[PDB]
């Protein structure tokens, strides 16, 4: 059989052969000619004006064996240009003689699990965010941070939903093998421009809302400590307590019985607003979750427009300007793992010291937060610097492309673990089911 990976490894060597030759090869000394370029399909030399440039068919192709010698054409005009046919598209090429497989059977399969994995996640996340916003019993400091982490993934999932639309948009022009390849190019110049930018911001927002999630989990564990309310906003002074209802002065909310309601409004003790400081500190959490990603995504986009905006800013060969997005995301990952490590240090001590129970919201969330932090930043720490050392983070980025076609689900993972797995929404599930029968 033909492999879906080896066919790309051979393609990577076809671009190596191409790049090597279109840089090693001497100029024609004709002055007026048509430039040597790589179609992202075939390797083309310099064309003599007024000649049919016939090239051998790419060997990375699976069916390359069935179509030997090769007959993929292009025409150099007297003007010094490659024949156009349609200028809003790529120049005329005749891939007619080189057409029809196992690697594209695996390619379509990889794309199918990628889009269904994204449709699955987005739906789960949108319905999940609808669970926390629909139910009033959940309008609390904690869930607000989740809804923002949902948002960054939701925008990222509708970001891939916009790029795929441009992919289906240009391909519905007609029916042709060359056009299929051409439709990719016409969209690789225009639609790709703004979407891939917002996508890069979304990803930056995932990792940074993961940071504040871990930070909020640290604050929820490092917390004399006082509390408040989310409904009416009553502040429960623990140093003052509430003996007028049966709680002596100098008692923490953690030691108030569950059979308790707010003295002002009357809502349950399960609707406590955490430490009275949680309110304003959320503004910072937003400032860290969205603010910081802007602080390095627009600098990158700016220079990826003032210096190299050719080919949807995807080609990063001349200079490593992509560090403007990698290093801050790597920084987030190192502290997300440092939070992860410190959280376990505290929980084990707090549990053993009897100062904390597994039944708590802080532990229930720890189970979830300590699960996202490891998987979502794992790859972005080991490779980040180790691979950066040499030109083999080159072939690792081809593997990351394949990863991204499996990391489509990582949106649903956030949805389940932070909503579907929540013991509180499960009580709301039981309340809604009981309200019918």
């Amino acid at each position: 059989t033909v492999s879906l990976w080896e066919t790309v490894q051979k393609w990577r060597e076809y671009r190596r052969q191409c790049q090597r030759s279109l840089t090693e090869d001497p100029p024609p000394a004709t002055d007026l000619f048509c430039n040597r370029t790589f179609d992202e399909y075939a390797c083309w030399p310099d064309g003599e004006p007024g000649s049919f440039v016939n090239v051998s068919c790419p060997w990375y192709l699976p069916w390359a064996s069935s179509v030997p010698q090769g007959h993929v054409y292009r025409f150099c005009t007297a003007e010094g240009l490659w024949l156009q046919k349609d200028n809003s598209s790529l120049p005329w090429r005749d891939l007619s003689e080189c057409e029809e497989s196992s690697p594209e059977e695996q390619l379509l399969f990889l794309y199918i699990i990628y889009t269904v994995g994204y449709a699955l996640s987005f739906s789960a996340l949108v319905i999940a965010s609808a669970i926390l916003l629909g139910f009033r019993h959940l309008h609390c400091t904690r869930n607000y941070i989740h809804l923002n982490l949902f948002a960054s993934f939701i925008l990222r999932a509708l970001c891939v939903f916009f790029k795929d639309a441009a992919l289906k948009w240009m391909y519905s022009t007609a029916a042709q093998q060359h056009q299929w390849d051409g439709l990719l190019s016409y969209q690789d110049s225009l639609a790709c421009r703004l979407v891939f930018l917002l996508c890069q911001y979304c990803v930056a927002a995932n990792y940074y809302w993961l940071l504040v999630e871990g930070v909020y989990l640290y604050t929820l564990l490092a917390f004399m400590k006082k509390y408040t309310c989310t409904v009416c906003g009553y502040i429960y002074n623990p140093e003052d307590g509430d003996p007028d209802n049966g709680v002596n002065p100098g008692t923490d909310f953690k030691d108030i019985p569950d059979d308790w309601v707010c003295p002002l409004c009357g809502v349950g003790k399960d609707q406590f607003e955490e430490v009275e400081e949680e309110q304003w500190i959320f503004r910072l959490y937003v400032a860290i979750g969205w603010g910081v990603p802007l602080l390095f995504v627009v600098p990158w986009g700016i220079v990826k427009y003032l210096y190299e905006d050719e080919g949807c800013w995807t080609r990063n060969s001349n200079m490593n300007y992509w560090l403007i997005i990698r290093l801050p995301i790597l920084f987030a990952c190192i502290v997300n793992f440092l939070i992860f490590v410190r959280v376990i240090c505290i929980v084990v001590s707090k549990l053993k010291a009897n100062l904390m129970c597994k039944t708590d919201i802080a532990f229930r969330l720890a189970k979830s937060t300590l699960t996202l932090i490891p998987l979502l930043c794992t790859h972005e720490v080991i490779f980040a610097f180790v691979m950066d050392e040499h030109a083999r983070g080159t072939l690792r980025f081809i593997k990351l492309f394949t990863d991204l076609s499996f990391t489509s689900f990582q949106g649903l993972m956030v949805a389940i673990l932070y909503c579907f797995v929540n013991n509180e929404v499960q009580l709301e599930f039981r309340k809604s089911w009981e309200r019918w029968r």
Partner: antibody
Amino acid sequence: EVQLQQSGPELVKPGASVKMSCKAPGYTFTSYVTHWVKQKPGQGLEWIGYINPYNDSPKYNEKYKAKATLTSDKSSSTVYMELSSLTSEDSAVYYCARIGYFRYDEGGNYALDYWGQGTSVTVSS
Amino acid sequence: QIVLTQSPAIMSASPGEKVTISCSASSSVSYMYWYQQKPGSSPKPWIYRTSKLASGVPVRFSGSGSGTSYSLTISNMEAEDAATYYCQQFHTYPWTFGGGTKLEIKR
């Protein structure tokens, strides 16, 4: 033998601008770029520049930059050459020509086969 | 930029005499192109790729050249061949033409 249907003759005052048409019955899939050539008696024959109609991007002779302005019509598929700030030096016949290829297999066998009638310009007060 | 200089200015030949029009370029070009323009019409491709003849051109005409120095020649000269002949370069931009050589017929 004229195939390119060009515009009529023009009498323009010095300092003005003239914009002439070059309607082609239809651009060949092989030749679509129209070249403009200046024939001023005694000056010989001068290639002004060309206009790529598929991308509306034109090539100019450095001599005729900020003098000629080459544009193309999408619908009618017609080339246009504007001549700003005109003087006596600009009174000439103006052709629009397209390359006709002899043997596409071999490189360099071509010539400005498709010629226009020629739009004469008289720059006089 | 590159300059095409073609000598003589006007050439007068009796029928059946050898006509030979030159065209020396400034910089060395690959191929030379010639156009026959008859007073009263637009120019016409006459010789392409230095020595190749355009369709309908009689075999008396022959293009010859290399580097900078090129020429157009006629053997069995005939009055039909009286016109201005422009050499052209397609090798570089801007595309240079020749001054033209008006050919007349001695009698």
